[PDB]
Design a protein around this ligand. Structure first.
Ligand SMILES: CCCCCCCCCCCCCCCCCC(=O)OC[C@H](COP(=O)([O-])OCC[N+](C)(C)C)OC(=O)CCCCCCCCCCCCCCCCC
Ligand SMILES: NC(=O)C1=CN([C@@H]2O[C@H](COP(=O)(O)OP(=O)(O)OC[C@H]3O[C@@H](n4cnc5c(N)ncnc54)[C@H](OP(=O)(O)O)[C@@H]3O)[C@@H](O)[C@H]2O)C=CC1
Lengths: 293, 342
């Protein structure tokens, strides 16, 4: 029945990808004195169905100067990635308990840059070429802060096994030991994230990033007998983070590129190095090095 | 003439030309171009559209306000015909279905309907009729197209003795269903032209001359009763055109002498799709049938219209087919395709 478990994950995540959009528009709506989708079905419950089947009935126009092969495989990778990093999440018990789950999460999430890079190239337009160039450099700039934060975070965890994160936190949320890193981590997650697909690809990244941040910094207690306790806690924590993720979507003017690079390489990277230096010696400092096994 | 029908104005949109057209089946390859030319001097078009108005919406911006009067009708309803042409100086018919449908058999679109409008329009009191008939149509052809058009042509001419009949040879244009049809071989594998296609000659004509002929036929008094044949100024063996247009598109020309009996079944296999079939068994041999050069039939030059050669009026339609690899190119490039020139 293991295959059934995959569909018991991919589809609801796909629906979860579908259904937080109404949350977004109504949160973004009610924020600006507005109402959000509330006329199509009760409180816009059927609004996601109101757009999806319309989109699939819309003809997918293709640019004349577009390489079809790349134009159709770039979304293939984009969706394939966006629904793959959901598999090793230590949600109650992960589908895959890869001993190197954190590395697998990073390598495969850093692969998303290919989709946007190919989309700009395959589209073959002046707008698409720069937009791909801007998006990728913004993205490829920000794994170095991503990797260091996660690396330095995991010194006090014990290994890259994502299931071990629960044991590490247990007593207190792990933010209380690395809250300078949490703001370091959370901000970096904002910027790293056919056309019908591209909704799904980046969007699962939005929730999973917050799901990834949820387990990493704000853990829960996984009772061996009853697993529903971790389920509710995990969902509630990743909902609060995502609401915050859209809380800041309509609360700041968007970053400009020169500051976007300046913010990292001159005010985020050097501080990330110091915290990593702080969190590499502190387990040694207090003889609190964790067990890998 | 009727008091509110005297031609006025210099031929602008808000100038009453006098012609009161009732073009049938304007939502087609030729209907759009003719209704534009009829709308370009101020003729109140009374087209019965039948499909969704959305597909007929693009006909709105080719006429003054209150000129293109869309009307509802049914092909199998005489009363529908009677209403639309009740008050019309002329009635123009282009009802044509290139493929075979379940609801309309091929004779339904070319025997019943073309004659089903002539007698009632005469009953209503029309003054003209420009029902067209394919030039290549033959009574004893193996294609249902050429048989059906011929038998319907005599009925409409007999029922309406003044019904001018236009004989277009091959109306090429933006979506003529030949040039893009010839371009369509790229996805469908090797070009399945039978016997390498060394035994068939076509004479195509650029569409807007044909529409120019139709309006000219409208204002020309001699058109009544006569039959006009509309052909281009040069003719080609079909192996030239397929090599030609592939070279104008700069696509790799990939001919293949597929046997005749194979394409006969494949044509109906293309028709298996419930939606618009890509290729029909009626068109499999319609391509391979050559053109006649009947001299007694008056042509465009006699009607006062010069015929543009296909070479010049090709880059417009062709540019859609070519990809980026030679999109920036211009005319010439491709060799001037060799004509056999009768
Ligand atoms: C014993 C103690 C050991 C550890 C001590 C650690 C050092 C002491 C604490 C240091 C400061 C706190 C940690 C680092 C924070 C970032 C530092 C930094 O560069 O700031 C200035 C930076 C840059 O500010 P700037 O660009 O104006 O100025 C920087 C300095 N110059 C001018 C020289 C370049 O601030 C930002 O980047 C602004 C925010 C950008 C993102 C926009 C959205 C913000 C959303 C905020 C609300 C949500 C927060 C969620 C938090 C996580 C929740 C799970
Ligand atoms: N390549 C070609 O198209 C060639 C065409 N011809 C002939 O010249 C004329 C071209 O007309 P054009 O408009 O360009 O052709 P199209 O096939 O592009 O469009 C035909 C038009 O007539 C309507 N129509 C066709 N059959 C019926 C029917 N049975 N009942 C109701 N409406 C119908 C169509 O409705 P809808 O839009 O809904 O389909 C459309 O408005 C026709 O007589 C055609 O047979 C001759 C040689 C080649």
């Amino acid at each position: 029945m293991f295959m059934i478990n995959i569909l018991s994950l991919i589809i609801p995540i796909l629906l979860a990808v579908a259904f937080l959009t109404l949350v977004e528009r109504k949160v973004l709506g009610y924020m600006q004195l507005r109402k959000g989708p509330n006329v199509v079905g009760p409180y816009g419950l059927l609004q996601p169905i109101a757009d999806a089947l319309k989109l699939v009935t819309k003809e997918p126009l293709r640019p004349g100067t577009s390489s079809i092969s790349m134009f159709i495989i770039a979304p293939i990778l984009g969706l394939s990635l966006a629904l793959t990093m959901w598999v090793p999440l230590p949600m109650p018990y992960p589908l895959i308990n890869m001993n190197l789950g954190v590395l697998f999460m990073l390598a495969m999430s850093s692969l998303a840059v290919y989709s946007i890079l190919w989309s700009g190239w395959a589209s073959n337009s002046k707008y698409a070429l720069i937009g791909a160039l801007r998006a990728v450099a913004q993205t490829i700039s920000y794994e170095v802060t991503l990797a260091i934060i996660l690396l330095s975070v995991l010194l006090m965890n014990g290994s890259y096994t994502l299931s071990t994160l629960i044991t590490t936190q247990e007593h207190i949320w792990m933010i209380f030991t690395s809250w300078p890193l949490a703001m370091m981590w959370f901000i970096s997650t904002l910027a790293e994230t056919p056309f019908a697909m591209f909704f799904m690809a980046e969007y699962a990244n939005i929730i999973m990033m917050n799901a990834f941040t949820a387990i990493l910094f704000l853990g829960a207690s996984h009772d061996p007998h009853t697993p529903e306790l971790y389920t509710i806690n995990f969902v509630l924590k990743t909902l609060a983070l995502t609401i915050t993720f859209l809380w800041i979507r309509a609360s700041y003017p968007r970053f400009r590129y020169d500051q976007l690079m300046h913010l990292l390489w001159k005010s985020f990277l050097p501080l990330t190095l110091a915290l990593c230096m702080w969190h590499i010696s502190l387990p040694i400092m207090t003889a609190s090095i964790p067990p890998q096994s | 003439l009727h008091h509110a029908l005297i031609p006025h104005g210099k031929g602008g949109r808000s100038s009453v030309s006098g012609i009161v057209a009732t073009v049938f089946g304007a939502t087609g390859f030729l209907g759009r171009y003719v209704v534009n030319h009829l709308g370009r001097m101020g003729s109140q078009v009374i087209v019965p559209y039948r499909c969704e108005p959305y597909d007929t919406m693009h006909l709105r911006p080719m006429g003054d306000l209150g000129q293109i009067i869309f009307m509802e009708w049914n092909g199998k309803d005489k009363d529908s015909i009677r209403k639309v042409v009740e008050h019309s100086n002329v009635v123009i018919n282009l009802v044509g279905r290139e493929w075979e449908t379940k609801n309309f058999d091929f004779e339904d679109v070319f025997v019943k309907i073309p004659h089903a409008i002539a007698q009632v329009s005469k009953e209503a009191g029309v003054e003209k009729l420009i029902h067209i008939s394919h030039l290549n149509a033959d009574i004893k052809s193996p294609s249902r197209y050429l048989r059906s058009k011929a038998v319907g042509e005599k009925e409409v001419r007999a029922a309406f003795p003044e019904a001018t009949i236009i004989k277009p040879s091959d109306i090429f244009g933006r979506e003529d269903r030949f040039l893009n049809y010839f371009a369509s071989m790229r996805w469908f594998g090797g070009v399945p032209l039978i016997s390498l296609g060394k035994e068939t000659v076509k004479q195509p004509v650029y569409i807007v001359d044909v529409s120019k002929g139709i309006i000219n036929a409208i204002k020309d008094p001699d058109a009544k009763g006569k039959t006009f044949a509309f052909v281009g100024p040069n003719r080609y063996l079909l192996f030239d055109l397929v090599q030609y247009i592939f070279a104008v598109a700069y696509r790799p020309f990939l001919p293949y002498p597929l046997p005749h009996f194979a394409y006969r079944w494949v044509g109906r296999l293309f028709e298996v799709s419930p939606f618009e079939p890509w290729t029909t068994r009626d068109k499999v041999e319609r391509v391979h049938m050559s053109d006649m050069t009947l001299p007694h039939l008056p042509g465009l030059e006699d009607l006062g219209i010069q015929a543009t050669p296909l070479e010049l009026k090709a880059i417009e339609v062709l540019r859609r087919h070519r990809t980026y690899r030679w999109l920036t190119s211009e005319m010439e490039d491709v060799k001037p395709a060799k004509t056999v020139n009768i």
